[PDB]
Coordinates of N, CA, C and O and ligand atoms in Angstrom, one line a residue:
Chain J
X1429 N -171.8 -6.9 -29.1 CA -172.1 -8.0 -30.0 C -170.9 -9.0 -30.0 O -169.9 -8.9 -30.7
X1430 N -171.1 -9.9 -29.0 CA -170.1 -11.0 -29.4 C -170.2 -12.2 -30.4 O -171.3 -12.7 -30.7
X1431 N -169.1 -12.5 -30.8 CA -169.4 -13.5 -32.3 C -168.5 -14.8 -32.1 O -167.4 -14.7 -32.7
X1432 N -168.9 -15.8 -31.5 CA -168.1 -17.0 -31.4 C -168.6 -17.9 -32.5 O -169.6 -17.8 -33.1
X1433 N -167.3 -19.0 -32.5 CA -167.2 -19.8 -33.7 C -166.5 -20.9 -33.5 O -165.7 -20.9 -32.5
X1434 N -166.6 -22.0 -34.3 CA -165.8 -23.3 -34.2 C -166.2 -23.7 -35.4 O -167.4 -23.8 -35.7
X1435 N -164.6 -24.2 -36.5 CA -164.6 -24.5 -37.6 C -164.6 -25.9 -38.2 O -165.3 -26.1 -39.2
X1436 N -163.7 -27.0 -37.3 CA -163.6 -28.1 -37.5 C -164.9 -29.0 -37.0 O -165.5 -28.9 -35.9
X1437 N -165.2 -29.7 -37.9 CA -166.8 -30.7 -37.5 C -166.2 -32.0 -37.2 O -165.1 -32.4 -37.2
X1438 N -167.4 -32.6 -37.0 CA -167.0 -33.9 -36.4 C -167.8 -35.2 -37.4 O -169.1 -35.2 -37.4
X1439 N -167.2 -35.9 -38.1 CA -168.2 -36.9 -39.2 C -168.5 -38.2 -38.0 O -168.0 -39.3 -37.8
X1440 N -169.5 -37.5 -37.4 CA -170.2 -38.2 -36.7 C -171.6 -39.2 -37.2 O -171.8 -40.4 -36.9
X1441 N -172.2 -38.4 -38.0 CA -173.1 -38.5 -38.8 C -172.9 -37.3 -40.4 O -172.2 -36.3 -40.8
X1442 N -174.0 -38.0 -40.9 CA -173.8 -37.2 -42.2 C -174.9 -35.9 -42.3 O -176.0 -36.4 -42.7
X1443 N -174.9 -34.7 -42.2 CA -175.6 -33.7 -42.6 C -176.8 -33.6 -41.5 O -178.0 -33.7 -41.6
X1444 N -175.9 -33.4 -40.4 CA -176.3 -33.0 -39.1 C -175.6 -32.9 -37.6 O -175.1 -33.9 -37.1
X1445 N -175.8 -31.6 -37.0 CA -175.0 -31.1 -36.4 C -174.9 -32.1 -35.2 O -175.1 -31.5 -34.2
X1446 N -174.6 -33.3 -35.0 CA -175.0 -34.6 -33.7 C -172.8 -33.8 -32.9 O -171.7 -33.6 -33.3
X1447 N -173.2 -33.8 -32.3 CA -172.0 -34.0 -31.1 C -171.4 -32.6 -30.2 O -172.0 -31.6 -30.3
X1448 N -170.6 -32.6 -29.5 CA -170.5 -31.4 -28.8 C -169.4 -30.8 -28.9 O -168.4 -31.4 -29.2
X1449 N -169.5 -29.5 -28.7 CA -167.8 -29.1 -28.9 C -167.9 -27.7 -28.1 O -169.1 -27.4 -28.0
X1450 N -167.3 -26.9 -27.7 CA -167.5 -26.0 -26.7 C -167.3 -24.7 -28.2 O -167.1 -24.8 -29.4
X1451 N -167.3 -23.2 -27.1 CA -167.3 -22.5 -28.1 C -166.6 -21.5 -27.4 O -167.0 -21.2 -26.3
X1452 N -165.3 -20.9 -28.2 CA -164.5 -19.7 -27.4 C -164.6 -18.3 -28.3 O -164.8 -18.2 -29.6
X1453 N -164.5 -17.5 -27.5 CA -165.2 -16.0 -28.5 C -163.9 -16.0 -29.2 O -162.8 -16.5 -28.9
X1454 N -164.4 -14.9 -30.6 CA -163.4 -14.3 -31.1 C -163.3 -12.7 -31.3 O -162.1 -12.2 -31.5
X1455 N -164.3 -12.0 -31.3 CA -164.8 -10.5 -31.6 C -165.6 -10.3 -30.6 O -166.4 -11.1 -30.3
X1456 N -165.5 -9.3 -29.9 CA -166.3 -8.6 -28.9 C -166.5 -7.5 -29.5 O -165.4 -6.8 -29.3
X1457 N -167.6 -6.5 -30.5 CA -167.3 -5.6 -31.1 C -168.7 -4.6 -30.5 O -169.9 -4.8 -30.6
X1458 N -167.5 -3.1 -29.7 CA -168.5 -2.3 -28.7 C -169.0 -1.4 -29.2 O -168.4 -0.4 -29.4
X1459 N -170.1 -1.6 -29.5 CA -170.9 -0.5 -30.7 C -172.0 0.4 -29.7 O -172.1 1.6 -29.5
X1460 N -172.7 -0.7 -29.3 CA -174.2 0.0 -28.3 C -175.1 0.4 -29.5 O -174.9 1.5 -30.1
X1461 N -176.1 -0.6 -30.0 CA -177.0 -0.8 -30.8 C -177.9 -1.6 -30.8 O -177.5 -2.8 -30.5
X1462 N -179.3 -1.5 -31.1 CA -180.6 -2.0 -30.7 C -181.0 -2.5 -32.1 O -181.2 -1.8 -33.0
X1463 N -181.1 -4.3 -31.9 CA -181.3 -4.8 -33.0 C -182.5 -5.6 -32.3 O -182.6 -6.2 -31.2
X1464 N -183.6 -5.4 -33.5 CA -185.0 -6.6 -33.3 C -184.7 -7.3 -34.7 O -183.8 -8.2 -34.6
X1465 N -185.0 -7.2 -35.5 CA -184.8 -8.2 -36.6 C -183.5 -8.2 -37.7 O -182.7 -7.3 -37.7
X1466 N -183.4 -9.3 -38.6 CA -181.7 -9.3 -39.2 C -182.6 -9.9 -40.0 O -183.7 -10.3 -39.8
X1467 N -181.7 -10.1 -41.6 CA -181.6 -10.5 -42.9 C -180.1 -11.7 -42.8 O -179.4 -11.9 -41.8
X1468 N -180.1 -12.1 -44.2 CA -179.3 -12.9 -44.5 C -178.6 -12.7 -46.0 O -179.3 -12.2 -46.9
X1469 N -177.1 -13.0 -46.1 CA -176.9 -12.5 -47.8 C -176.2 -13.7 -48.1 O -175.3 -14.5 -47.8
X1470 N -177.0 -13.4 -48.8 CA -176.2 -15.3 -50.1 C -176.0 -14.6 -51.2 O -175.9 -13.4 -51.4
X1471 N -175.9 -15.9 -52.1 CA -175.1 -15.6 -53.6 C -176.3 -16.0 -54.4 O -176.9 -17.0 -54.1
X1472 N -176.6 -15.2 -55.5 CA -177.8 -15.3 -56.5 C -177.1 -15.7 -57.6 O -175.9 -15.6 -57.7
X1473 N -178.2 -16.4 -58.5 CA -178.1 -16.7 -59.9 C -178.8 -15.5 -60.4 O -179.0 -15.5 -61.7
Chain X
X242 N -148.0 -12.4 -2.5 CA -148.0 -14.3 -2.4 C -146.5 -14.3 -3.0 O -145.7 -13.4 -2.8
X243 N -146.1 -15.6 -3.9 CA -144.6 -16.0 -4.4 C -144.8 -16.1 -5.9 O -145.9 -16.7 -6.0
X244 N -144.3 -15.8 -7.0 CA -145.0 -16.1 -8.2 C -143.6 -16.7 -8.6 O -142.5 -16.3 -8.4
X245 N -144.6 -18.1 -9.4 CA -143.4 -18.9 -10.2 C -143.9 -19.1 -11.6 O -145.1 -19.0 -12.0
X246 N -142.9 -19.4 -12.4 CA -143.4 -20.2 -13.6 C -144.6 -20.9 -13.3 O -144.8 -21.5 -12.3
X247 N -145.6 -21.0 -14.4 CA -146.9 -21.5 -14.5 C -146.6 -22.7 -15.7 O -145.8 -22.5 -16.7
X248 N -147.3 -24.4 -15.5 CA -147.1 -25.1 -16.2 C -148.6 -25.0 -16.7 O -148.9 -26.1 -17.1
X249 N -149.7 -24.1 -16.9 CA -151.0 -24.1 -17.2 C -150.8 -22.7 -18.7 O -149.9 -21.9 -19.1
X250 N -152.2 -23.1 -19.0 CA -152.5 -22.2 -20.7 C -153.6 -21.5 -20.7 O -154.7 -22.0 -20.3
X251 N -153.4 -20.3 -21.1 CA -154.4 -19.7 -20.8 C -154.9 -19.4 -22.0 O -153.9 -19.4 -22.8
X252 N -156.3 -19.0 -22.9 CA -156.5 -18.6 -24.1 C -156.5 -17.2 -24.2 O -156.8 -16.3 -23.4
X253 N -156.3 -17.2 -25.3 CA -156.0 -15.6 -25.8 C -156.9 -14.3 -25.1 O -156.4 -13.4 -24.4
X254 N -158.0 -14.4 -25.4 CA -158.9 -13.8 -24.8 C -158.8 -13.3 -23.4 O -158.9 -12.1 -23.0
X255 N -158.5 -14.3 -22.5 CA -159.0 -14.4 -20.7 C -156.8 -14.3 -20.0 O -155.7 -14.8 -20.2
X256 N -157.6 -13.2 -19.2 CA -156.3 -12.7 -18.5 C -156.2 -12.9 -17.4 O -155.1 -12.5 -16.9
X257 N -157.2 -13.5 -16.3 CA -156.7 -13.7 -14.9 C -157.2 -14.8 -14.9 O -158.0 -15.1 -15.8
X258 N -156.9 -15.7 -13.9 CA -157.6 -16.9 -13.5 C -157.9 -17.2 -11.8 O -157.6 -16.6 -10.8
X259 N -158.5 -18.1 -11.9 CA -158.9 -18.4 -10.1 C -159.3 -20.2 -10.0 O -159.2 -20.8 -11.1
X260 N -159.9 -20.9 -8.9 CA -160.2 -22.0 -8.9 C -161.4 -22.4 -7.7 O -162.4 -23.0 -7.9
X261 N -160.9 -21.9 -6.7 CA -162.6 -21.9 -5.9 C -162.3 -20.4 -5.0 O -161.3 -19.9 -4.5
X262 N -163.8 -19.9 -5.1 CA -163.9 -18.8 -4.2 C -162.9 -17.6 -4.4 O -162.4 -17.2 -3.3
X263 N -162.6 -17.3 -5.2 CA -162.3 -16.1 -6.2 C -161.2 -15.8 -5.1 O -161.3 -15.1 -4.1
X264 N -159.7 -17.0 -5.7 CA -158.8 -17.1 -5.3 C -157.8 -17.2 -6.8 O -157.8 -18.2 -7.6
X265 N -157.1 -15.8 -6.9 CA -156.7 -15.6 -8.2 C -155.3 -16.7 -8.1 O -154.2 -16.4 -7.7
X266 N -155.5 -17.8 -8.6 CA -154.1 -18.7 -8.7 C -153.4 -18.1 -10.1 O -152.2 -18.4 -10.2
X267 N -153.7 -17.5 -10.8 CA -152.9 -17.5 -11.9 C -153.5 -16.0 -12.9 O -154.6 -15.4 -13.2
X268 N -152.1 -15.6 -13.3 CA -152.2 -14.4 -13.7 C -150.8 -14.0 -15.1 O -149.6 -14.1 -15.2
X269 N -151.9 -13.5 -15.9 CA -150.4 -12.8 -17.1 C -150.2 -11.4 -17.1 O -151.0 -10.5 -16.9
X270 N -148.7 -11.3 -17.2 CA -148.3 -10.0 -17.4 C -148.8 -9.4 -18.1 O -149.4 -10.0 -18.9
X271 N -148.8 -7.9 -18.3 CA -149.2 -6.7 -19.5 C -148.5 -6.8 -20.1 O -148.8 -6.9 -21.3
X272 N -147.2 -7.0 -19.8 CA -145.8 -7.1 -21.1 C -145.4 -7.8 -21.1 O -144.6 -7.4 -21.9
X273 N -144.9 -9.0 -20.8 CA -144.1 -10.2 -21.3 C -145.3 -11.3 -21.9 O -145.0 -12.3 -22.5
X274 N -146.6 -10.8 -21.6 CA -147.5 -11.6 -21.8 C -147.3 -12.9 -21.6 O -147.7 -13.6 -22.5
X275 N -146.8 -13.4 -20.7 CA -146.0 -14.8 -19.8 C -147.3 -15.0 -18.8 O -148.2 -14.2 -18.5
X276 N -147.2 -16.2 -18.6 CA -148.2 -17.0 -17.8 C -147.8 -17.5 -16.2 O -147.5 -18.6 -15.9
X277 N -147.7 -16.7 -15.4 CA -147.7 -17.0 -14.2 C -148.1 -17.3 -12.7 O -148.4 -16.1 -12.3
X278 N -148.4 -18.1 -11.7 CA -149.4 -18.8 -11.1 C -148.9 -17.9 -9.6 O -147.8 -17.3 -9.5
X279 N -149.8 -17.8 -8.8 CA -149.7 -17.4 -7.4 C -149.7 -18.3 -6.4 O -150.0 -19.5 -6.5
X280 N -149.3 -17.8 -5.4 CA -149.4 -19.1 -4.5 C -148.9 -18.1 -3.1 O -148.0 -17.3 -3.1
X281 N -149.9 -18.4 -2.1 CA -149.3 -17.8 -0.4 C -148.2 -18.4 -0.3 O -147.9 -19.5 -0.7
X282 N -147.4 -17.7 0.2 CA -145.9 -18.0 1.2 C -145.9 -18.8 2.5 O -146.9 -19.4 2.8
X283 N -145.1 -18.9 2.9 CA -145.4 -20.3 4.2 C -145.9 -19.5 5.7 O -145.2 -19.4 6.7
X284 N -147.1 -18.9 5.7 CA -147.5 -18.3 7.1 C -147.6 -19.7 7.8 O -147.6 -20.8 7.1
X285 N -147.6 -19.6 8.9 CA -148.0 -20.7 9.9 C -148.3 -20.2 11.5 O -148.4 -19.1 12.1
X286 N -148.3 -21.6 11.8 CA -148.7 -21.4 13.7 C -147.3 -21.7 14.5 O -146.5 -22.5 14.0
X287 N -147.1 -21.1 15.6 CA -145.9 -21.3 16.4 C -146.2 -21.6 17.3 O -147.2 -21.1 17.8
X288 N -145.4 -22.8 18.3 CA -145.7 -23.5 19.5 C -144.0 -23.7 20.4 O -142.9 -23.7 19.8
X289 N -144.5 -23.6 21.7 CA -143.8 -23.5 22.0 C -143.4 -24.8 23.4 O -144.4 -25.2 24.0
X290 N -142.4 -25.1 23.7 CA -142.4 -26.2 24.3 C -141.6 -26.0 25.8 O -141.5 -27.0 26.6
Ligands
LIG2403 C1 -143.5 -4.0 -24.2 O1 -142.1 -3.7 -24.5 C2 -141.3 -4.8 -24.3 C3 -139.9 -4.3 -24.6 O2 -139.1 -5.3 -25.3 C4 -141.7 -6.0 -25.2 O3 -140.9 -7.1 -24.9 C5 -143.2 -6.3 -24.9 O4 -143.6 -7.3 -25.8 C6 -144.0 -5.1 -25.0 N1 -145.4 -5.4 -24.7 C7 -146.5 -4.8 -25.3 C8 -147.8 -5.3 -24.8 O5 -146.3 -3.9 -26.1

């Protein structure tokens, strides 16, 4: 499972992802596991 | 080959490099972790007169 990322945006436009930026890994983490579906976790009231 | 100081950067991740046809120009140590380039030595042709 690799997990790349890029932090700084570009105010190209307002509240949408418009422009390009390349992407360099950070985590290569070697587990060997069989994923079909994923969730998401946020913050509740 | 001859290895000199490298004026190129390599990112953290990626440890060898090349440029056409998997010709390794550039390479980092295991331990100095230093950035240094390759390059052939002067072979050539000899003529004679
Ligand atoms: C290996 O040891 C040398 C001895 O000083 C040190 O300079 C170098 O950073 C070390 N490299 C690693 C990968 O531990």
């Amino acid at each position: 499972f690799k997990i790349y990322s890029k932090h700084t945006p570009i105010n190209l436009v307002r509240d949408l992802p418009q422009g390009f930026s390349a992407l360099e890994p950070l985590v290569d983490l070697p587990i060997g596991i069989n994923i079909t579906r994923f969730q998401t976790l946020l913050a509740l009231h | 080959g001859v290895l000199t100081e490298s004026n190129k950067k390599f990112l953290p991740f990626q440890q060898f490099g090349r440029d056409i046809a998997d010709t390794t120009d550039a390479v980092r140590d295991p331990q100095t972790l230093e950035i240094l380039d390759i390059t052939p030595c002067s072979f050539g042709g000899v003529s004679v007169i």
